[PDB]
Symmetry: C2
């Protein structure tokens, strides 16, 4: 059923159109129609010193085509035009064939930092030769994840120079559908004593890394000039300027911040809708943006002149989750996951990166157009 | 009146204690007591494709001492223990004298990117000699801010090399209590034609920069070892390990992301409470974290061994606002500003950076303790 006029329709009419799309079960549609909120009692369980609740808008971005599957995407944002722009971007890219996306890996990285290591090279050697035993020790400490087919998968050790020197042990862990912060905290605590013994050093801390390079996800889109503007040669102008806009963000940190901000107008909105920790996704992606020695734009837009196409691409660390307290307790979050056809964390991650690149597309097109 | 037991008190008892503190007017206390939310109708004005609203917890972090003034800080977070940790951090630092903070500048930066500039050096020369006229042209285009004592204050031009070369013009603008994105969009549009004429180039875009280096704010705290632990020599151990934790984050991007994530658990929570754009604050701070060539921790913790003190310090771009749509329309946001004694954007910024450093303190202390 057509989605056009959805923006101009009234709140009641939007709800009836959504109902007509038959995306939600009777209970979820009713829940949405009485705008069921998470209660103070439930809020009081999630957080501390709770004295009430706080509301933001809940919107829909329809027609998000990811790998030939269409989604109606939920957004939570307080910013005017963020949703309109994501919706507009999404429709264009759908006409153009939607997004093509891949998950390169899905693992969480945990680290233990050791210091007062007399012989870092010898220590590094011992720990790395004891790798399989150490992985077994982490997996025994958290047997709940091995039974579900995940667990600790790899281990490496780095000498990091400085004031003072640190010997850092990284574990790589399949956490399946979970974020993994508690899991990795427990696994890493089990390893501390043996790591101290083997290194003859003191363990400083054992903690998940929000720099999730074992969970990179890339999205691309391929947009023919005729979808950018029907007027003759105007599509090429627009695409040219978007490519220049992309180059500008590679060149100037002052542009790149803003460029990457716009991407996260979309990303944080759906992360909130899905009960995901946006602080974590923000940190990893913004760290990723500075990996080649300077802070740069997270996406790139280039031209295919023979095919007459605008190409957009983006890789982000996206260790999102489909289970967790907020997902279990906030009834709108459960609704959001149902609305999305209950994607696995992998599929959700591919939708989120796509949303990011859509949001970016509308931002650049608006900025560079007369 | 004492705040202890506030965490363990019931939701009703917390509200009665808050009432006893007399921090809110009768209307605001009543508004909070019936948990007045922003309505769907109001939500529908803020955002697009609105089909409902979305709720998160609303909590209090009491006893935040900033420059000898105590605040009860509002938080909006879905993460267990974030509030408890901020509250715990805040009480310790209050005993220790609270935070000392300063605003170095408060200005917004806008940029126009020019390309196809044949002679960038000549163009740079012309624009810079025409500086005062250009500033006047921006101020005429937005007279609403000059009457309130703000406006365009400075202009500079940079040659940024790459593929291709860009000539970028930056304006620096006092936007008073406002974020300034609309203001700077309008001012920069007024400048485009003349900038093109003077440079003999094409303007790509005119846009606010979320890399807000003209709005840096620093907070510090000075914590005696005896406040970290009453046991003999245990305070020194803890402080030593926090300093090492700080060094770890300077050395390893994998730690720094997580380190900076924790800071923003606090910052984003109060930014939501106050109707502020957290995507913008995230982008600028995370870009700031990579300014010295590598992605590093945003705060530093060092020891004063003679004075027996743990010192924490943090500088962040904090161009927050005290006016704007969300602030005008979401009744809990208005409440949050009233709760805080209606601080100016400058004072709010100093509270937010302090909150960040408090959140960081509890994170590090927990990670490095037995
Ligand atoms: Na309406
Ligand atoms: Na209606
Ligand atoms: Na919390
Ligand atoms: Na509590
Ligand atoms: Na309440
Ligand atoms: Na929304
Ligand atoms: Na995983
Ligand atoms: Na970490
Ligand atoms: Na993460
Ligand atoms: Na990770
Ligand atoms: Na990866
Ligand atoms: Na992934
Ligand atoms: Na591709
Ligand atoms: Na750009
Ligand atoms: Na951002
Ligand atoms: Na953008
Ligand atoms: Na969330
Ligand atoms: Na959420
Ligand atoms: Na990330
Ligand atoms: Na991450
Ligand atoms: Na870019
Ligand atoms: Na993933
Ligand atoms: Na939630
Ligand atoms: Na609901
Ligand atoms: Na699910
Ligand atoms: Na956008
Ligand atoms: Na936009
Ligand atoms: Na309660
Ligand atoms: Na109660
Ligand atoms: Na919006
Ligand atoms: Na609308
Ligand atoms: Na509703
Ligand atoms: Na909260
Ligand atoms: Na300003
Ligand atoms: Na910009
Ligand atoms: Na900003
Ligand atoms: Na700025
Ligand atoms: Na400054
Ligand atoms: Na400032
Ligand atoms: Na100081
Ligand atoms: Na740290
Ligand atoms: Na963050
Ligand atoms: Na932290
Ligand atoms: Na907000
Ligand atoms: Na808000
Ligand atoms: Na910032
Ligand atoms: Na900023
Ligand atoms: Na640090
Ligand atoms: Na400020
Ligand atoms: Na709001
Ligand atoms: Na309220
Ligand atoms: Na105010
Ligand atoms: Na914390
Ligand atoms: Na913590």
């Amino acid at each position: 059923i057509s989605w056009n006029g959805f923006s101009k329709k009234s709140y009641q009419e939007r709800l009836e159109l959504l109902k007509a799309q038959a995306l939600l079960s009777p209970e979820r549609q009713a829940s949405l129609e009485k705008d069921e909120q998470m209660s103070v009692t439930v809020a009081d369980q999630l957080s501390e010193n709770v004295v009430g609740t706080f509301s933001l808008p809940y919107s829909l971005v329809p027609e998000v085509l990811v790998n030939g599957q269409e989604y109606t995407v939920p957004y939570v944002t307080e910013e005017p035009s963020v949703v309109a722009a994501a919706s507009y971007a999404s429709k264009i890219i759908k006409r153009a064939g939607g997004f093509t996306t891949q998950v390169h890996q899905r693992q969480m990285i945990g680290q233990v930092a050791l210091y007062q290591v007399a012989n870092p090279k010898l220590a590094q050697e011992k720990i790395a030769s004891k790798k399989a035993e150490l992985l077994e020790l982490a997996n025994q400490a958290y047997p709940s994840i091995v039974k579900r087919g995940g667990g600790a998968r790899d281990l490496h050790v780095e000498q990091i120079k400085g004031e003072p020197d640190f010997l850092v042990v990284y574990i790589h862990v399949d956490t399946q559908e979970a974020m993994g912060a508690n899991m990795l905290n427990t696994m890493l605590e089990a390893l501390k004593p043996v790591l101290e013994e083997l290194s003859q050093g003191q363990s400083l801390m054992g903690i998940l890394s929000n720099y999730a390079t074992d969970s990179l996800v890339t999205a691309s889109c391929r947009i023919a000039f005729r979808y950018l503007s029907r007027q003759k040669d105007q599509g090429r102008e627009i695409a040219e300027k978007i490519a220049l806009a992309s180059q500008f963000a590679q060149a100037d940190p002052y542009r790149a911040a803003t460029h990457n901000k716009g991407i996260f107008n979309g990303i944080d909105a759906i992360l909130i809708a899905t009960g995901n920790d946006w602080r974590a996704i923000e940190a990893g992606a913004h760290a990723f943006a500075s990996r080649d020695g300077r802070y740069q734009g997270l996406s790139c837009w280039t031209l295919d002149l023979e095919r007459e196409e605008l190409v957009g691409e983006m890789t982000l660390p996206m260790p999102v989750a489909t289970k967790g307290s907020s997902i279990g307790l906030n009834p709108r979050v459960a609704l959001s996951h149902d609305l999305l056809g209950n994607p696995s964390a992998r599929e959700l991650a591919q939708i989120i990166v796509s949303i990011g690149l859509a949001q970016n597309f509308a931002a650049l097109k608006a900025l560079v157009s007369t």
